[PDB]
Nucleic acid binder design. Structure first.
Lengths: 82, 145, 37, 136, 93, 174
RNA sequence: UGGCACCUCGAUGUCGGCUCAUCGCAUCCUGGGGCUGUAGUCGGUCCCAAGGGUUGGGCUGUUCGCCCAUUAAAGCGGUA
RNA sequence: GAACAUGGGUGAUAAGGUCCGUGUUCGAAAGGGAAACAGCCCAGACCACCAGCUAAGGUCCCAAAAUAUAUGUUAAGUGGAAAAGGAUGUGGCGUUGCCACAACUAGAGUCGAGUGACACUGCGCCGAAAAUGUACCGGGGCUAAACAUAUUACCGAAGC
């Protein structure tokens, strides 16, 4: 019944939909998106490139391949095979 | 509809039986009497007519019960009055008016219909004295399944 | 007598035996004696 | 009242209470351990209302060694009000125990004292206990 | 200590808890010449480990063949029961 | 289990004959009493009834110690015959007899009367006291006890009539 | 004293007092007791016991509450 | 939108409370079982029949079918409603040890036959007080017509 002492909270922001966008072993187009994330969780490998410090995209057609780089770091690649 | 014999009046005949409760355990000797009163031991039994025979007891003061139910298992009764709870009789009511004891027990295992009330009026229980129905030529059932 | 659920053989003179519903105790003094409650 | 000093967050979640124990299933600092057999939240106030008492039986005799410390501080609202306008201010400190954990440890003193002392102490805690004899 | 176990069986469904009240334990020897070829022991002949080795020494095995000194090393003590589960040995080589 | 093979004598002024579920002690010591002793398998071969009925039933080990003693107390108290004494603590009990109706007094404005039964002898060497006899302690006992408890003796200061001897809880106040 | 909002807003309409009741036991009086730091009268805590009893006034509207004079006693509650 | 079963937050490991997540049923679903009971268990009605086999649940009487068989467990009517505790309750699991332990007594000698702490238990016992009337086995009643297993036979829906 009594006007309460209110809440010093309540704020948040819209989610960005990060993660993988193309599956390993499937065929693509030149220029398609493969992953979206802050910082380089998965490095760009063969015939792929990093955009503006994110969006690892493909540069030529073919099939994608996820792989390990050194000991603890991964990478993505595309091969021309048809 | 098809062929199904239906027993009716002037086609069924009732008899007279005599059971003895010398070494019975009330309940066990009550369920076997209810079936005979309902007439569920004939091949021509219909559930819309009064089929069966009459039963007569001659030893209602010899009934026994195992366990401590002789001191417990009290009988309650109301008279539709503010605080009319009547429980004067308990489990030792087999010495005073024991005919009602068996009567109620056998009347508590019958249907509460208009035909189930007239079927319970074909039972005569006696404390220990012999029955005066010698002109009915009652057959001695005694032995129970 | 006393009445509490935690009866036992209380002092070094009181010792127990089961009755009907009470597991009360018998001994020499009426300052240590109890029946279940 | 075994409580800490510096805490990052003051409002937390109720701890999980299911399954067996993890660590502290044995005894070190003394010959004799008091085990636990069910699950509950011991709440610092038990501990100091079941420590001073065990020592008031011990008459400042031998020494004890506590094997339970309340970390997660539980909170609670004051007077019964409406539902939901924030969270109540922290007012307690809780510790969670599971079956198979030694809560107290003592040394040197006779086994008659051990039995007739942990039976005194367990009569305050909401968990059911059982004696342990360092049974190698 | 002359204590003898036998080669028990794997591919076990977990229906053994109930054949466990009747005494047993697992046991697996380490060391060359054989492998984790497990052996099954019983308890109330271990109600007398009190005199057997202490904790550090020798035990016979009689486990068909290669019956030599084998050392039960680890501990797999169990809560809430005063029971035991999977005590296990090793070869001396 | 308690008292199993404690097969003791029956050297009597009497005999024992078993048909029913009981005994009966006809002897010049005590003529012809018995209850129903035991529905156990009772024997009596040449002088005594010590019959090995009960075993392996929890009820059986109290049945033994009870029904060997139904027979036992009956045969003995109807053979032996043994009631001990009672006490005279105070001044002014008026102890007497009138057949099977004695008298005492306690300090009531009106000495209230008590009368007893037979088969328990009304024995009076008693001028401020009680000391009686009979045959069966089951029947001299409850009456040796109605006489115990007329004015429960002063648990402070001495007055009363009671049994053969113990201590009473003696209490003090202002 | 509160918490929840499941029946009722084409109406489930009112706190004390008056009149008349009925049920409970967690017993105020009477009764049967073991135990008292109970000699006796008395009285304190406990156990069993629900049949019937359980007063007239002064003072604010008081369901409360204090006071006056009695009585074997002036018990606590449930029943919109 | 609702309940039930799970995974969390919030509140008091309070609510037939409140907010999200994954399923099913009700909503829009009749039929059989749970004494009566939208949400629980079994199962989805096109229409006729005085045909047959089964599911959950059951087979002394009310009321269809075993007063079936073999084995144990239980003396409270437990079954047929709660907890910390308490203890000369107990059927099973291990001890420990006198060849004395029941009447010995220090706050020493015998005679004749079982004694106990401890440990895991399975079933019981006490802890257990409310207002119209017995008053949660549904009722009569039951020492098996109860509980834990095994194998059977038969009954049972608008399912086949």
């Amino acid at each position: 019944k009594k006007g309460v002492s209110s809440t010093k909270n309540g704020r948040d922001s819209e989610s960005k939909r990060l993660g993988a966008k193309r599956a390993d072993g499937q065929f693509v187009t030149g220029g398609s998106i493969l992953y979206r994330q802050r910082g380089t969780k998965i490095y760009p490998g063969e015939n792929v490139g990093r955009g503006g410090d994110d969006t690892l995209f493909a540069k030529i057609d073919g099939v994608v391949k996820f792989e390990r780089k050194g000991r603890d770091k991964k990478q993505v690649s595309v091969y021309a095979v048809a | 509809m098809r062929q199904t014999f239906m027993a009716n009046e002037s086609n069924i005949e009732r008899k007279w039986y005599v059971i003895d409760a010398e070494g019975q355990t009330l309940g066990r000797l009550s369920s076997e009497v209810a079936s005979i009163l309902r007439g569920k031991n004939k091949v021509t039994y219909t559930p819309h007519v009064d089929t069966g025979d009459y039963v007569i007891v001659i030893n209602a003061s010899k009934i026994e019960f195992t366990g401590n139910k002789e001191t417990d298992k009290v009988y309650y009764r109301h008279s539709n009055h503010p605080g009319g709870i009547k429980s004067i009789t308990a489990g030792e009511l087999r010495r005073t008016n024991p005919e009602r004891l068996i009567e109620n027990s056998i009347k508590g295992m019958l249907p509460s219909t208009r035909l189930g009330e007239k079927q319970g009026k074909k039972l005569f229980v006696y404390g220990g004295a012999e029955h005066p129905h010698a002109a009915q030529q009652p057959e001695n059932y005694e032995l129970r399944g | 007598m006393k009445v509490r659920p935690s009866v036992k053989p209380i002092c070094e003179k009181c010792k127990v035996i089961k009755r009907k519903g009470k597991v009360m105790v018998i001994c020499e003094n009426p300052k240590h004696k109890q029946r279940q409650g | 009242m075994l409580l800490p000093k510096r805490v990052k967050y003051r409002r937390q979640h109720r701890p999980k209470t299911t399954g067996r124990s993890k660590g502290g299933n044995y005894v070190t600092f003394g010959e004799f351990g008091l085990q636990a057999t069910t699950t509950s939240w011991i709440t610092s106030r038990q501990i100091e209302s079941a420590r001073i008492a065990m020592t008031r039986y011990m008459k400042r005799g031998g020494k004890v060694w506590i094997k339970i410390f309340p970390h997660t501080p539980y909170t609670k609202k004051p007077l019964e009000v409406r539902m939901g306008a924030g969270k109540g201010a922290v007012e307690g400190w809780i510790a969670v125990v599971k079956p198979g954990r030694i809560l107290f440890e003592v040394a040197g003193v006779s086994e008659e004292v051990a039995r007739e002392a942990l039976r005194l102490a367990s009569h305050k805690l909401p968990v059911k206990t059982k004696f342990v004899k360092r049974e190698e | 200590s002359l204590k003898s176990i036998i080669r028990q069986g794997k591919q076990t469904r977990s229906d053994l808890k109930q054949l466990r009240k009747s005494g047993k334990v697992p046991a697996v020897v380490y060391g060359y010449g054989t492998k984790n070829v497990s052996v099954k022991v019983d308890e109330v002949e271990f109600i007398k480990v009190i005199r057997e080795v202490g904790r550090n020494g020798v035990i016979e095995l009689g486990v068909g063949s290669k019956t030599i000194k084998v050392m039960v090393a680890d501990y797999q003590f169990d809560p809430l029961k005063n029971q035991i589960t999977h005590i296990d040995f090793l070869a001396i080589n | 289990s308690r008292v199993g093979k404690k097969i003791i004598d029956i050297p009597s002024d009497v005999t024992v004959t078993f048909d029913g579920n009981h005994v009966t002690v006809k002897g010049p010591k005590g003529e012809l009493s018995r209850t129903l002793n035991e529905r156990m398998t009772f024997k009596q071969e040449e002088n005594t009834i010590e019959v090995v009925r009960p075993s392996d039933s929890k009820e059986d080990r109290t049945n033994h110690g009870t029904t060997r003693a139904l027979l036992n107390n009956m045969v003995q108290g109807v053979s032996q015959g043994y009631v001990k004494v009672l006490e005279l603590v105070g001044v002014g009990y008026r102890a007497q007899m009138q057949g099977k109706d004695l008298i005492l007094n306690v300090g009531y404005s009106h000495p209230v009367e008590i009368k007893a039964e037979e088969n328990i002898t009304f024995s009076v060497e008693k001028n401020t006291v009680v000391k009686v006899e009979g045959i069966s302690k089951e029947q001299v006992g409850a009456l040796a006890s109605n006489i115990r408890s007329v004015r429960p003796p002063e648990p402070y200061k001495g007055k009363g009539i009671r049994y053969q001897g113990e201590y009473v809880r003696r209490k003090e106040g202002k």
